[PDB]
Structures are given as C-alpha cells and as structure tokens.
Amino acid sequence: AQTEQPPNQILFLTNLPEETNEMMLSMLFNQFPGFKEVRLVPNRHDIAFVEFTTELQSNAAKEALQGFKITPTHAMKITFAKK
C-alpha cells in the first residue's frame, strides 16, 4: 500500500489512466519550477513516480494535483515516495 510521510523530493502516484505516458506527467508537473523527471511503469501505467529538486516543491505539486483528472475517470492520487 502507498503511504504518506514528511515531505520528500520524490512522489509515488496511483489511480492513473491505463494509457498514461511519461510525457503526460512531465507536461503536468513541469508547470512547477522544481520539477525534474518522471518514471512510468510501462507494464501497468496506473502507477508512476515523479522527481523534483526539493521536498517543498514536490509537496506544492502534490497539494496542487491530488485529485486532478488526468482523464475524466482517473483522479491522480499522489503520495511521497521513500528513499
């Protein structure tokens, strides 16, 4: 199961579209000035990871995009990943 934590510069994401692509999440999260990268799971697509310069900026992106419909039936869940 996914878990929340104190802020971290890496996020773990769930309930994504069955057709999610790295470029979609990059375009969504690159709106924030601390985004760096994404890592999809190309055998499921419904989960992914995202990476940032600092924990406060991934936190800002998390609060900004938790619940965001990537498509009408796929509200993005977001959690902090762990290192």
Curated annotation (Swiss-Prot):
Location(s) in or outside the cell: Nucleus
All copies of domain RRM, residue ranges: 9-83
Self-association and partners: Belongs to the spliceosome where it is associated with snRNP U1. Interacts with the SMN complex.
Protein family per UniProt: Belongs to the RRM U1 A/B'' family.
Purpose: Binds stem loop II of U1 snRNA. It is the first snRNP to interact with pre-mRNA. This interaction is required for the subsequent binding of U2 snRNP and the U4/U6/U5 tri-snRNP. Plays a role in regulating sex-lethal splicing.
Protein's UniProt name: U1 small nuclear ribonucleoprotein A
Residues of the full protein shown: 134 to 216 of 216
